[PDB]
RNA sequence: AGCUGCUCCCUAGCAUGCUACUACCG
RNA sequence: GCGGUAGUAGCAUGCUAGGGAGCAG
């Protein structure tokens, strides 16, 4: 027992029927339970009538019957209503202030997190209430994700190709590269240890963790975690230092980090670093640059996935002596180039999923778009450093949301730090980019790139443009273009030097079937971070908003040192982004 | 009680009584109305105060019935548990040695203390220190109770396996030292 | 204590004066107690006046007496009637919805199961009420079968011939081949272990179990069981697969089973196999055909009697390897060609009477005609496999009913599955038969054989038929024709090659006596299953409905590869079925 | 994880008893 | 005016029951 969230007074009650059973005071809980449909409260004992085999679970109908709570037809001669006076009988009934404006918590509870206003309230509410919204999001997605089917493989067709069989009553969720499956191997006693995999249609193509034998009867299931409550908020109430505290500047100047010397002082006197950095503007070069700002300082690496800490690592093998550094991995498939099970050190690479509890000096965050309110806050919830960096930008895709069907989340309300670049403003950016020719910078600036970025090296006049509409026949959550992959069929072979490029499609089924005629490597822009290639191909597929919005293009256009093909179907960003247009074969 | 026959009589009696009081007719009218509402509250007393012992007694009976049903279910549960235990422990003693030593008795009666001594297939020895180990369970096979047993598996007080090559006189001070030997009866 | 059958709500009361004391709710119990004359209810204690040596057992005249229930003349000053408000005082008096239409269970309770409407309600009612009706039928038969006399043998005349004596007050039942006797041998302490025997008039002829000495004073009694309640219904709510689940088709085709290939897929996607199959159309050949459809499958063989599992076995010595196979026999005389006391295997043959509890894949049912609502449901009450076979047909005789004296049971209401071939339709049948020439196929089709079947090989023109009337003088339940066995006397010797045939009669007394002039083996069509012979004789005897009807005639005619004799007395099926007719000598 | 004996505190029930107030009647 | 019976409220003694705790052999 303890204090409540909305009210901060000590209480002993819960919403039984609500999601994550928060602490709520007498009048506090009364408002929450009378304004909406949660009508089950838990004290040290639950509020139910102990009548043998009775049914009722309401709160406003049960009464007191001496030692216990009883039903109306069950109650003794004279009683005392448990729910009166505008209060529910509980601990600390006097020191309770309550509240009037309860529409916030009521909406957050009764919501299903399906539409845009859901997240509008999730951010625009109280910060503790937004932590609660984060945990409610996690619980809802966990409950909805195990509710799908079980992959009961029965055949063995080939390697990376099998046949699927699923049970009655549960549909089969979108076999995407977004949500990883999880399987266990059968035996007479138990069934365990196959790992996490990723399936899609083929015959069924599977993406396996590590090579082994494919047995019969093994199930592949989207398993869930045991998510836990949060302690610290998203970020700290912020501050500007009077001095360079716990820090002292360097003595020399670094060639690769001469472009960021103006970025050293500006955050050495505050906690956070509000980054506005497009993919490939020296995004991670400062993660090793500001690292050697003072090698005695304790820098904390975070990552969205193991691929993010790999991009944070794939250049740490040259400038960083490995005398004392490590990365955290719990008891899979990834780079492990540093120490394992070493935590308190000079440099700690880490994915937020298994970060230990310590205190340090620097915190080099990994791209902020993927982070929601939950996982960004986990860092300061376990490791409370007292000045930060927030590498990343809402300029790219976030971590996707499963049942977001009505109008998709806006490019402002990703998470907490995300909003104050267009509410207070940014301080962080490199005036130089790293891949982009003139085609990928200036016209992209009229987008949410703020009319801010120049080109690295000058124009190539080589990124292609199309003029068509496309014909589509779509599967359960995927859609392939017979003609629009037939139009690129003419562009590829008739431009013989064009095929060092990787064609990407967010409907990876397109990349599944395009390898049958062309064989180019498959890739989706879901994990377009880390991929940095010279020639790239892209298409529009459907002209609907699953890919048409700003954050869905700009992960794919900003890729090339030379050029990218863009097969257009719609006219919005066809009129927005301009490239060289030619004749249609 | 709210809808029993006495209620209508009492209510209408007092309604007419107080309507006539608002009329204020006589001096015997007050006496008569007050006597009516004395004897009509003498109906709402027996029918609304002693009618409620019936319900309380019925509830006594209902709670007793619930208690008896629960106590009757627990008995069946424990009966099943006991007979399952008996039958499961039966399936280990019906060997051919037991039949032999029972058919060698003159009445079918034997002392119980000799049943494990002559029919058990596995022996367990608990040893306090090294000298006792050297006197009883030395080597790989030993003799006891007019039989010969062969060793398999040795553990210590922590239930951790010990190899037969570690039980020496020099390595003795490094062992948790009750030792438990398990042996099998040799044919 | 638990839920009631009509209501599925928890209760604690019994219909005491009623047959099988089913669970009934408060309102349920009041309807059943006031609509008809069972007026004795059992709570956790009985509703009986505890006055010393009282006699009252009624429910509505007993009153409460404080701790106990007390009689009117013995009740305390103030009591509380146990049966008012439309309810009986019991547990869970609130959560009980009751029912209004109680005529069904009332009629099922008060009936004696002697006429046709009995079984009409036993079928057309609720399926759980069909379970209850099956148990009620079984209980009525068990109490009526022991109520007959005791066979007190006191003589020793010869072997298979003795003399009977029965006590006063009990008649001796029909000495039939439908109900088996049971004897126990006398000794000074107890009397046990003679076995099951079958008697009839001689002198008294006996069909003995196994050879032994016939002692003096031994009784032979129609001993009853101690039958138990049921759990599972007749059949599972049905379903068609989207795949071949729990199965995988074979690779080759079989010569013996190429006539059934079209029947492989048709139930490979559902549970039950409702079969319309005339006797001997490949009736059991598919049982070994579908068995090796997939030899890894778990196939459950049921049996009607050990003769049925023998007909299942009498062909399994060749196509089946005995590497892992068994049949069940509890602690007698029959074939036991496989493992004994082996249950969970590749194949287990079994008679439902002693089937254990496991889970399997295939269940090959033996002919459904005998099976009642009870016995067919027993199999899935103990072994719940999840696709089934229902080999059998209402085309033949069922197991007889003892006191079925009024209107005989109709050929549609045998059991559950037997109704939906002329209510929904049948799916299984072999378009080939195995013995029948032209005389026993096409004309039989105008009967309940659906105009569906052809001949195996063509006409023989050898089946015989007569034109007479018959004269009968009958015993207790038997009837012998002195003249009509005298007219076949002229047919036999004057056709010298006729005497390979066996003469059949439902009144085996005819076959008992015809052996005194002819000596041919005795046989009745009570167990005409398994008997498949070249030459057969039959006669009509009395023209009544005991043998003239559809399932009573057709059980005997479908027998010969060449021909059978047909001695008719009535003209219904003389005009219905036509054969070779000649002059009467 | 046992068999007894003694003591303190809280709750509920019933009987008995005391005392007080209303009603009927004599 | 008194006695009785039927009611309502408070107090007292003990008797059973349930729960927590302490000591001794
Ligand atoms: Zn709530
Ligand atoms: Zn209740
Ligand atoms: Zn009844
Ligand atoms: Zn009585």
Curated annotation (Swiss-Prot), chains A, C:
<feature type="binding site">
    <location>
        <position position="7"/>
    </location>
    <ligand>
        <name>Zn(2+) 11</name>
    </ligand>
</feature>
<feature type="binding site">
    <location>
        <position position="74"/>
    </location>
    <ligand>
        <name>Zn(2+) 13</name>
    </ligand>
</feature>
<feature type="domain" description="(+)RNA virus helicase ATP-binding">
    <location>
        <begin position="252"/>
        <end position="430"/>
    </location>
</feature>
<comment type="function">
    <text>Plays a role in viral RNA synthesis. Multi-functional protein with a zinc-binding domain in N-terminus displaying RNA and DNA duplex-unwinding activities with 5' to 3' polarity. Activity of helicase is dependent on magnesium. Binds to host TBK1 and inhibits TBK1 phosphorylation; the interaction with TBK1 decreases IRF3 phosphorylation, which leads to reduced IFN-beta production.</text>
</comment>
<feature type="binding site">
    <location>
        <position position="38"/>
    </location>
    <ligand>
        <name>Zn(2+) 12</name>
    </ligand>
</feature>
<feature type="binding site">
    <location>
        <position position="71"/>
    </location>
    <ligand>
        <name>Zn(2+) 13</name>
    </ligand>
</feature>
<protein>
    <recommendedName>
        <fullName>Helicase nsp13</fullName>
    </recommendedName>
</protein>
<feature type="domain" description="(+)RNA virus helicase C-terminal">
    <location>
        <begin position="431"/>
        <end position="585"/>
    </location>
</feature>
<comment type="subunit">
    <text>Interacts with nsp8 to form the replication-transcription complex (RTC): nsp12, nsp7, two subunits of nsp8, and up to two subunits of nsp13. Interacts with host TBK1; this interaction inhibits TBK1 phosphorylation and decreases by 75% IRF3 phosphorylation, which leads to reduced IFN-beta production.</text>
</comment>
<feature type="binding site">
    <location>
        <position position="4"/>
    </location>
    <ligand>
        <name>Zn(2+) 11</name>
    </ligand>
</feature>
<feature type="binding site">
    <location>
        <position position="25"/>
    </location>
    <ligand>
        <name>Zn(2+) 11</name>
    </ligand>
</feature>
<feature type="repeat" description="LRR 8">
    <location>
        <begin position="223"/>
        <end position="243"/>
    </location>
</feature>
<feature type="binding site">
    <location>
        <position position="54"/>
    </location>
    <ligand>
        <name>Zn(2+) 13</name>
    </ligand>
</feature>
<feature type="binding site">
    <location>
        <begin position="277"/>
        <end position="284"/>
    </location>
    <ligand>
        <name>a ribonucleoside 5'-triphosphate</name>
    </ligand>
</feature>
<feature type="binding site">
    <location>
        <position position="18"/>
    </location>
    <ligand>
        <name>Zn(2+) 12</name>
    </ligand>
</feature>
<feature type="binding site">
    <location>
        <position position="49"/>
    </location>
    <ligand>
        <name>Zn(2+) 13</name>
    </ligand>
</feature>
<feature type="domain" description="CV ZBD">
    <location>
        <begin position="1"/>
        <end position="112"/>
    </location>
</feature>
<feature type="binding site">
    <location>
        <position position="32"/>
    </location>
    <ligand>
        <name>Zn(2+) 12</name>
    </ligand>
</feature>
<feature type="binding site">
    <location>
        <position position="15"/>
    </location>
    <ligand>
        <name>Zn(2+) 12</name>
    </ligand>
</feature>
<feature type="binding site">
    <location>
        <position position="28"/>
    </location>
    <ligand>
        <name>Zn(2+) 11</name>
    </ligand>
</feature>
């Amino acid at each position: 027992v303890g204090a409540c969230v909305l009210c901060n007074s000590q209480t002993s009650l819960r919403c039984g029927a609500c999601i994550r059973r928060p602490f709520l005071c007498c009048k506090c809980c009364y408002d929450h339970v009378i304004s909406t449909s949660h009508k089950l409260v838990l004290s040290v004992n639950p509020y139910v009538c102990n009548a043998p085999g009775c049914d009722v679970t309401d709160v406003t109908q049960l009464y007191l019957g001496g030692m216990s709570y009883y039903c109306k037809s069950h109650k003794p001669p004279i009683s005392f209503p448990l729910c009166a006076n505008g209060q529910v009988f509980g601990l600390y009934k006097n020191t309770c202030v309550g509240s009037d404006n309860v529409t916030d918590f009521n909406a957050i509870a009764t919501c299903d997190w399906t539409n845009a206003g859901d997240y509008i309230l999730a951010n625009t509410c109280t910060e503790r209430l937004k932590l609660f919204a984060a945990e409610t999001l996690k619980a809802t997605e966990e409950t909805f994700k195990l509710s799908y089917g079980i992959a009961t493989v029965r055949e063995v067709l080939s390697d990376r190709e099998l046949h699927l069989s699923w049970e009655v009553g549960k549909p089969r969720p979108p076999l995407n590269r977004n949500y990883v499956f999880t399987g266990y191997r059968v035996t007479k006693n138990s069934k365990v240890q196959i790992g996490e995999y990723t399936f899609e249609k083929g015959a069924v193509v599977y993406r396996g963790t590590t090579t082994y034998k494919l047995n019969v009867g093994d199930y592949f299931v989207l398993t869930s975690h045991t998510v836990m409550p949060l302690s610290a908020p998203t970020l700290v109430p912020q501050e500007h230092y009077v001095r360079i505290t716990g820090l002292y500047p360097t003595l020399n100047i670094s060639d690769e980090f001469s472009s960021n010397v103006a970025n050293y002082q500006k955050v050495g006197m505050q906690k956070y670093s509000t980054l506005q950095g497009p993919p490939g503007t020296g995004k991670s070069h400062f993660a090793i640059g500001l690292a050697l700002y003072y090698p005695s300082a304790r820098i904390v690496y975070t990552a969205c996935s193991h691929a993010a800490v790999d991009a944070l690592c794939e250049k740490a093998l040259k400038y960083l002596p490995i005398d004392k550094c490590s990365r955290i991995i719990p008891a899979v498939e990834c780079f492990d180039k540093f120490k394992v099970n070493s935590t308190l050190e000079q440099y700690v690479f880490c994915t937020v999923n298994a970060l230990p509890e310590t205190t340090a000096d620097i915190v080099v965050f990994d791209e902020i778009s993927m982070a929601t309110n939950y996982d960004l806050s986990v860092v300061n919830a376990r490791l409370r450093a007292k000045h930060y960096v927030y590498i990343g930008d809402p300029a790219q895709l976030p971590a996707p949301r499963t049942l977001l069907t009505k109008g998709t989340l806006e490019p402002e309300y990703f998470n907490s730090v995300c909003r104050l670049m267009k509410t207070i403003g940014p301080d962080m950016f490199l005036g130089t980019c790293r891949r982009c020719p003139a085609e990928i910078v200036d016209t992209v600036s009229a987008l949410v790139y703020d009319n801010k970025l120049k080109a690295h090296k000058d124009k190539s006049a080589q990124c292609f443009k199309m003029f068509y509409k496309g014909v589509i026949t779509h599967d359960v959550s995927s859609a392939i273009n017979r003609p629009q992959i037939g139009v690129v069929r003419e562009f590829l072979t008739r431009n013989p030097a064009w095929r060092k490029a990787v064609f990407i499609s967010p409907y990876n089924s397109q990349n599944a079937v395009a390898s049958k005629i062309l064989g180019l490597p498959t890739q989706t822009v879901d994990s377009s971070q880390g991929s940095e290639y010279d020639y790239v191909i892209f298409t529009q597929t459907t002209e609907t908003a699953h890919s048409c919005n700003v954050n869905r293009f700009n992960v794919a256009i900003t890729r090339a040192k030379v050029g990218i093909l863009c097969i257009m179907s719609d006219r919005d960003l066809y009129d927005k982004l301009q490239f060289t247009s030619l004749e249609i074969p | 009680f709210s809808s029993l026959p006495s209620y209508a009589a009492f209510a209408t009696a007092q309604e007419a009584y107080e309507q006539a009081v608002a009329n204020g007719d006589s001096e015997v009218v007050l006496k008569k109305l007050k006597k009516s509402l004395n004897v009509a509250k003498s109906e709402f007393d027996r029918d609304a105060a002693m009618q409620r012992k019936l319900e309380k007694m019925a509830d006594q009976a209902m709670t007793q019935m619930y208690k008896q049903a629960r106590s009757e279910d627990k008995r069946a549960k424990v009966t099943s548990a006991m007979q399952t235990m008996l039958f499961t422990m039966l399936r280990k003693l019906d060997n051919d040695a037991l039949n032999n030593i029972i058919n060698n008795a003159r009445d079918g009666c034997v002392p119980l203390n000799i049943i494990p001594l002559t029919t058990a297939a596995k022996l367990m020895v608990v040893i306090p220190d090294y000298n006792t180990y050297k006197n009883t369970c030395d080597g790989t096979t030993f003799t006891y109770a007019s039989a010969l047993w062969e060793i398999q598996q040795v553990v210590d007080a922590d239930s951790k396996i010990v190899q037969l090559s570690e039980i020496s006189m020099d390595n003795s001070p490094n062992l948790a030292w009750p030792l438990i030997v398990t042996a099998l009866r040799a044919n």
